[PDB]
PDB file of C-alpha atoms in Angstrom:
ATOM      1  CA  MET A   1    -177.976 292.843  67.905  1.00 34.59           C
ATOM      2  CA  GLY A   2    -178.752 290.964  64.704  1.00 35.40           C
ATOM      3  CA  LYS A   3    -176.279 289.810  62.074  1.00 32.90           C
ATOM      4  CA  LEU A   4    -173.564 292.203  63.253  1.00 33.33           C
ATOM      5  CA  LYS A   5    -170.013 291.582  62.065  1.00 33.55           C
ATOM      6  CA  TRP A   6    -166.508 293.060  62.216  1.00 32.00           C
ATOM      7  CA  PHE A   7    -166.048 296.295  60.261  1.00 33.29           C
ATOM      8  CA  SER A   8    -163.324 298.951  60.447  1.00 33.69           C
ATOM      9  CA  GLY A   9    -165.073 301.872  58.798  1.00 31.88           C
ATOM     10  CA  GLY A  10    -167.611 302.865  56.165  1.00 31.22           C
ATOM     11  CA  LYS A  11    -170.035 305.469  54.826  1.00 32.56           C
ATOM     12  CA  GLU A  12    -172.458 304.834  57.686  1.00 31.72           C
ATOM     13  CA  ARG A  13    -171.388 307.471  60.220  1.00 31.21           C
ATOM     14  CA  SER A  14    -174.079 306.340  62.656  1.00 29.70           C
ATOM     15  CA  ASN A  15    -173.172 302.630  62.522  1.00 29.44           C
ATOM     16  CA  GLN A  16    -169.518 303.684  62.753  1.00 31.66           C
ATOM     17  CA  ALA A  17    -169.643 304.835  66.367  1.00 35.18           C
ATOM     18  CA  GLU A  18    -171.605 301.701  67.304  1.00 34.23           C
ATOM     19  CA  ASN A  19    -168.842 299.532  65.837  1.00 32.21           C
ATOM     20  CA  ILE A  20    -166.149 301.513  67.661  1.00 36.76           C
ATOM     21  CA  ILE A  21    -167.721 301.114  71.091  1.00 33.77           C
ATOM     22  CA  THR A  22    -168.038 297.398  70.475  1.00 34.35           C
ATOM     23  CA  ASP A  23    -164.242 297.327  70.148  1.00 34.19           C
ATOM     24  CA  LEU A  24    -163.353 298.421  73.689  1.00 30.87           C
ATOM     25  CA  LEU A  25    -166.156 296.147  74.883  1.00 28.50           C
ATOM     26  CA  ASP A  26    -164.221 293.164  73.543  1.00 30.13           C
ATOM     27  CA  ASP A  27    -160.962 293.756  75.432  1.00 28.46           C
ATOM     28  CA  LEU A  28    -163.115 295.019  78.322  1.00 25.30           C
ATOM     29  CA  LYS A  29    -164.634 291.563  78.579  1.00 25.61           C
ATOM     30  CA  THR A  30    -163.854 290.153  82.016  1.00 29.80           C
ATOM     31  CA  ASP A  31    -161.402 293.051  82.413  1.00 34.46           C
ATOM     32  CA  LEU A  32    -159.600 293.703  85.692  1.00 38.20           C
ATOM     33  CA  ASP A  33    -159.417 297.478  85.324  1.00 38.60           C
ATOM     34  CA  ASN A  34    -162.854 298.654  84.172  1.00 37.83           C
ATOM     35  CA  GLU A  35    -165.844 296.664  85.416  1.00 40.56           C
ATOM     36  CA  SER A  36    -168.635 299.182  86.006  1.00 41.97           C
ATOM     37  CA  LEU A  37    -167.468 301.786  83.498  1.00 40.90           C
ATOM     38  CA  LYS A  38    -168.507 299.424  80.689  1.00 39.38           C
ATOM     39  CA  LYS A  39    -172.061 300.250  81.768  1.00 35.72           C
ATOM     40  CA  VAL A  40    -171.646 303.592  79.956  1.00 35.58           C
ATOM     41  CA  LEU A  41    -170.332 302.306  76.617  1.00 37.25           C
ATOM     42  CA  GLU A  42    -172.791 299.389  76.650  1.00 37.34           C
ATOM     43  CA  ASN A  43    -175.781 301.527  77.628  1.00 35.30           C
ATOM     44  CA  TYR A  44    -174.944 304.417  75.293  1.00 34.29           C
ATOM     45  CA  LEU A  45    -174.204 301.873  72.560  1.00 32.16           C
ATOM     46  CA  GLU A  46    -177.790 300.613  72.875  1.00 31.59           C
ATOM     47  CA  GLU A  47    -179.085 304.161  72.304  1.00 31.63           C
ATOM     48  CA  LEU A  48    -177.729 304.201  68.732  1.00 34.42           C
ATOM     49  CA  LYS A  49    -179.884 301.091  68.194  1.00 33.27           C
ATOM     50  CA  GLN A  50    -183.015 303.136  68.837  1.00 31.99           C
ATOM     51  CA  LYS A  51    -184.420 305.429  66.138  1.00 34.14           C
ATOM     52  CA  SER A  52    -185.498 307.982  68.746  1.00 34.60           C
ATOM     53  CA  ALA A  53    -182.300 309.673  69.974  1.00 29.89           C
ATOM     54  CA  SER A  54    -179.879 310.996  67.368  1.00 29.42           C
ATOM     55  CA  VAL A  55    -176.494 309.331  66.959  1.00 30.22           C
ATOM     56  CA  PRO A  56    -174.557 312.586  67.542  1.00 27.24           C
ATOM     57  CA  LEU A  57    -177.121 313.501  70.212  1.00 27.65           C
ATOM     58  CA  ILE A  58    -176.185 310.547  72.396  1.00 25.37           C
ATOM     59  CA  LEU A  59    -172.448 310.443  71.655  1.00 27.27           C
ATOM     60  CA  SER A  60    -172.164 314.019  72.928  1.00 26.19           C
ATOM     61  CA  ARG A  61    -173.464 312.998  76.336  1.00 28.07           C
ATOM     62  CA  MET A  62    -171.249 309.885  76.288  1.00 28.45           C
ATOM     63  CA  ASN A  63    -168.030 311.877  76.645  1.00 27.34           C
ATOM     64  CA  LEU A  64    -169.631 313.847  79.483  1.00 27.59           C
ATOM     65  CA  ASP A  65    -170.695 310.555  81.044  1.00 29.44           C
ATOM     66  CA  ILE A  66    -167.447 308.620  80.776  1.00 27.00           C
ATOM     67  CA  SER A  67    -165.304 311.635  81.683  1.00 29.99           C
ATOM     68  CA  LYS A  68    -167.142 311.999  84.991  1.00 34.82           C
ATOM     69  CA  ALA A  69    -166.820 308.251  85.557  1.00 31.12           C
ATOM     70  CA  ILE A  70    -163.050 308.746  85.468  1.00 32.76           C
ATOM     71  CA  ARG A  71    -162.496 310.694  88.688  1.00 30.49           C
ATOM     72  CA  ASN A  72    -165.373 308.671  90.105  1.00 30.71           C
ATOM     73  CA  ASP A  73    -163.678 305.294  90.434  1.00 31.05           C
ATOM     74  CA  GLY A  74    -160.299 306.661  89.393  1.00 29.83           C
ATOM     75  CA  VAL A  75    -160.589 305.028  85.969  1.00 30.78           C
ATOM     76  CA  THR A  76    -157.890 305.422  83.334  1.00 29.80           C
ATOM     77  CA  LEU A  77    -158.398 304.879  79.598  1.00 29.97           C
ATOM     78  CA  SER A  78    -155.547 303.085  77.835  1.00 27.26           C
ATOM     79  CA  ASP A  79    -153.732 304.405  74.774  1.00 29.97           C
ATOM     80  CA  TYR A  80    -156.091 302.796  72.239  1.00 28.79           C
ATOM     81  CA  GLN A  81    -159.005 303.713  74.506  1.00 32.60           C
ATOM     82  CA  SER A  82    -158.399 307.463  74.737  1.00 29.87           C
ATOM     83  CA  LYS A  83    -157.596 307.328  71.013  1.00 30.91           C
ATOM     84  CA  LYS A  84    -160.815 305.615  69.973  1.00 32.11           C
ATOM     85  CA  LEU A  85    -162.562 308.247  72.102  1.00 31.70           C
ATOM     86  CA  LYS A  86    -161.603 310.933  69.583  1.00 31.17           C
ATOM     87  CA  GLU A  87    -163.525 308.902  67.020  1.00 33.36           C
ATOM     88  CA  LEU A  88    -167.125 309.946  67.658  1.00 33.65           C
ATOM     89  CA  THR A  89    -165.584 313.108  69.066  1.00 30.78           C
ATOM     90  CA  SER A  90    -164.863 314.654  65.656  1.00 31.05           C
ATOM     91  CA  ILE A  91    -168.026 313.127  64.161  1.00 33.58           C
ATOM     92  CA  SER A  92    -170.217 314.642  66.876  1.00 32.03           C
ATOM     93  CA  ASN A  93    -171.334 318.228  66.269  1.00 33.27           C
ATOM     94  CA  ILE A  94    -171.540 318.913  69.981  1.00 35.45           C
ATOM     95  CA  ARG A  95    -167.804 319.476  70.456  1.00 37.98           C
ATOM     96  CA  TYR A  96    -168.124 322.852  72.170  1.00 36.42           C
ATOM     97  CA  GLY A  97    -170.050 321.304  75.019  1.00 34.68           C
ATOM     98  CA  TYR A  98    -166.837 319.602  76.154  1.00 33.95           C
TER      99      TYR A  98
END
């Protein structure tokens, strides 16, 4: 929301994850594979917008949310997908939870 633009990376670690999620969302647009899964990325992505929940506090649950969504509807993340997943993975402090 707002005057958002395209950005690879930067000092803003919080805004970083938000930008990443937006990526998959693009190709996911009117996708044939994932249709309901996007609900996770989109929803979680909105969390970062709020100043209540912590960036790394929401991202941690994300992995636990998407992962479960896999076996659910037998979803499969593409190469770039699974790769971009490791993004907020290393940034998030809650890595042991996984």
